[PDB]
């Protein structure tokens, strides 16, 4: 809620990803925080299996409800950290409500 | 050093099988150039066939020779029955691959590969 990233660069999502679709680099931020400098998802490697959001200990990476994001070029499906943070800012209102409905089954 | 043979008891039987396969490939090249409508000539096809046989000229194990002949025959059956396509037949010629240097200095300039 404060606007801080949930992701702590633990790399559990990267380890479990069946498709090796996640690439992560991290270092200490300008303050002492443990944060990513690279967070990529190759959406053309991803199998949309959801293991990454299961593996995440802080609910940082989620699969949202959007399924209407087909593109005209391949490169537009290679998401870097800026694109994914924008997705979270774009979809948080729906995402938080969906997690609210399902987190007691998890 | 006692082992189970594949087809040939010794290297003289094996070389007989090798010569027979070479004849079958030699006879086939004119048909392959015709059926697949290749822009190479029959000499080029037969030169390539000869090249493939000479890369293995140093084998002395009849079981290894038996397998190369076995694989060579499957390779030929794919061609005669047109299970292969033009792309598969032309993969032997590496047309789109640029020439990699073999001398030291040329390798030195491009990168680190020995």
């Amino acid at each position: 809620p404060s606007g801080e990233e949930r992701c702590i660069a633990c790399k559990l999502c990267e380890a479990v990803c069946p498709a090796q679709a996640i690439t992560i680099e991290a270092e200490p931020r300008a303050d002492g925080s443990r944060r990513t400098t690279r967070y990529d998802i190759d959406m053309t490697k991803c199998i949309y299996c959801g293991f990454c959001q299961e593996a995440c200990p802080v609910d940082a990476i989620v699969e949202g409800p959007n399924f209407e994001f087909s593109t005209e070029t391949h490169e537009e499906l290679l998401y870097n950290k800026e694109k994914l943070l924008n997705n979270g800012d774009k979809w948080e209102a729906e995402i938080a409500a969906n997690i609210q409905a399902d987190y007691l089954y998890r | 050093t006692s082992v189970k043979p594949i087809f040939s008891r010794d290297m003289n039987e094996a070389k007989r099988r090798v010569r027979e396969l070479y004849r079958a490939w030699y006879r086939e090249v004119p048909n392959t150039v015709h059926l697949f409508q290749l822009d190479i000539s029959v000499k080029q096809g037969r030169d390539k066939v000869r090249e493939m046989f000479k890369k293995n000229a140093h084998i002395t194990d009849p079981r290894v020779v038996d397998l190369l002949v076995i694989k060579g025959k499957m390779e030929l059956e794919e061609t005669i029955k047109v299970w292969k396509q033009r792309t598969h037949v032309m993969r032997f010629f590496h047309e789109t691959e640029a020439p990699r240097p073999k001398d030291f200095l040329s390798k030195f300039y491009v990168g680190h590969d020995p």
């Binding site: 690439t23 190759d42 | 082992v3 594949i6 079981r63 076995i70 499957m74 794919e78 993969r91 789109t96």
Partner: protein, 207 residues
């Protein structure tokens, strides 16, 4: 009475042990080892010379009747001088039982084709030849079945790289699909996952 632990079935274990030695008594010329797993599967380890006698006996014998070849495959273990293990999984409908028969071979030693015993073996043996390079003698029609035409190598060998040696693309200059040495925009990332602490003392090997 232990909700999470798989129950044992010692009756089936007893029955399979008795049959395992029954097969060893009838086929001593070939059988090299018989074992029964803790989850009750019987494996017969035979000399490769006995593939036809052993499979024929299991199919035709009145106390066997393994009329169905469920699966036939190979395993590659590079540390063995006979690196390939050939595995036959058979099912007997009459006695509602399964049996596994295993043998071995290397890159240059042929294994007798079992198509005369099980016609199901025809494609299974082509797959083994295709993916492992094991040659099956007297096969009615041995050729690649899964790999691309003209493909070179046997991908299921442990020393064959995951991504192979060649990749394909369409080239406009020659107006056809071409094969070229493989380059990956992102190399597959090898993970070292094995923990350095032993997990199963029951399987420890002598030092």
């Amino acid at each position: 009475t232990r909700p999470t632990v798989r129950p044992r079935n010692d009756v089936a274990h007893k029955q399979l042990s008795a049959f395992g030695e029954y097969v060893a008594e009838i086929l001593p010329k070939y059988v090299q080892q018989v074992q029964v797993s803790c989850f009750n599967e019987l494996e017969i380890c035979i000399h490769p010379d006995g593939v036809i006698p052993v499979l024929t006996f299991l199919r035709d014998h009145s106390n066997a009747q393994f009329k169905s070849l469920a699966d036939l495959t190979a395993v590659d273990i590079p540390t063995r001088q006979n690196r390939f293990e050939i595995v036959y999984n058979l099912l007997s409908l009459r006695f509602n039982s399964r049996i596994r028969v295993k043998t071995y071979t290397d890159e240059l030693t042929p294994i007798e084709s079992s198509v005369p015993v099980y016609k199901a073996a025809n494609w299974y043996e082509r797959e083994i030849w295709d993916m492992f390079g094991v040659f099956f003698a007297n096969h009615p029609d041995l050729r690649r079945i899964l790999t691309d035409y003209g493909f070179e190598g046997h991908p299921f060998r442990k020393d064959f790289p995951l991504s192979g040696y060649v990749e394909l693309r369409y080239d406009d200059e020659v107006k056809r699909v071409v094969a070229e040495p493989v380059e990956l925009a992102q190399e597959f990332r090898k993970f070292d996952l094995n923990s350095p602490w032993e997990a199963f003392p029951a399987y420890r090997q002598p030092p």
